[PDB]
Amino acid sequence: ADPHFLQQPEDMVVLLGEEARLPCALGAYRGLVQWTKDGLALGGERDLPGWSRYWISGNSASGQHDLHIKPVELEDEASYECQASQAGLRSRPAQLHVMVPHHH
Amino acid sequence: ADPHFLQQPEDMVVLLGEEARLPCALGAYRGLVQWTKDGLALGGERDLPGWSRYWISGNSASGQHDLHIKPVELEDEASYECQASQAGLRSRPAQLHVMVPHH
Ligand code: NA
Ligand code: NA
């Protein structure tokens, strides 16, 4: 079978300072998987070097490639895609909304 | 120095079937470099596996990361960016137009 998504991320709202999980799963695909943030590719290495608060979790052999962000910051509000780079397959874009908690 | 572009691609028109070179060079950066095509990241391996007509040319030691396309097809018309993925650096987008002679 051809490469295909088994799970795709969706629009979500997360609180400032919490952890975000943007899910992605691919079937019949053994190549590079990575995430883009407003069109900027973050890279394929699982700990995402250069992005101290981002990493990819999940068993890559089983096809899971979830993007995690912790702690979430205001600058994380963006449109994210999961991409199978070698097959040209792109997920639906997922908008991450960051809400600031108000306290007193 | 901080990572910075030494050369960036620009808009270009290429005749259908010819070879295109979109130039990119980075200074003070040894991490991952890759190209996006209309926002689709092509990957970092210099042979660009999965893309039979694309490859990245140049020695990454010198910091040159030119995207090559041969032969150019209509499906290659797109906006291209060279990106230093670990630094968050993006080049100016470069539009590749393909010209088809008519006869
Ligand atoms: Na990281
Ligand atoms: Na290739």
From Swiss-Prot, chain A:
Residue ranges of every copy of the Ig-like C2-type domain listed in the record: 4-97
- Modification(s) after translation: N-glycosylated.
* Lineage: superkingdom: Eukaryota
Q: Where in the cell is it found?
A: Cell membrane
Please tell me in which tissues this protein is expressed: Highly expressed in beta-cells of the pancreatic islets. Expression is seen in podocytes of kidney glomeruli, and in the cerebellum and hindbrain at 12.5 dpc, in the spinal cord at 10.5 dpc, and in retina and hypothalamus at 13.5 dpc.
Q: Which cysteines are joined by disulfide bonds?
A: 24-82
Null mutant phenotype reads: No visible phenotype. However basal insulin secretion is modestly increased in pancreatic islets of KIRREL2 deficient mice.
Which proteins does it associate with, and in what oligomeric form? Answer: Homodimer. Interacts with NPHS2/podocin (via the C-terminus). Interacts with NPHS1 (via the Ig-like domains). Interacts with FYN.
Please state which protein family the record places this protein in: Belongs to the immunoglobulin superfamily.
**What exactly does this protein do?**
May regulate basal insulin secretion.
Name this protein carries in UniProt: Kin of IRRE-like protein 2
